[PDB]
Amino acid sequence: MEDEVVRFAKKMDKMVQKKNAAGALDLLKELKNIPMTLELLQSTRIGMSVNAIRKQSTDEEVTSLAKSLIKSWKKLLDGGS
DSSP: OHHHHHHHHHHHHHHHHTTOOTTHHHHHHHHTTSOOOHHHHHHHOHHHHHHHHHHSOOSHHHHHHHHHHHHHHHHHHTOOO
8 A cells, every 4th residue: 555655656746847747647546545544644745746746737637636635635634633
């Protein structure tokens, strides 16, 4: 589970660098199936990648998926026990 997310982060990073993240859609849909934990988010930093991809999205589905991912992930970060 964790390395797969690290893989997505490294893949996504190249898309923001290329100023076209339309293709990130699939990588974002993949993340939607993984039970993300706060612990995983600290190690993977995937939330930062997805937030950047949300700006470089171009396709509305990508922005929508990234927006949906971060919506769930927020509670993990907003969880002070």
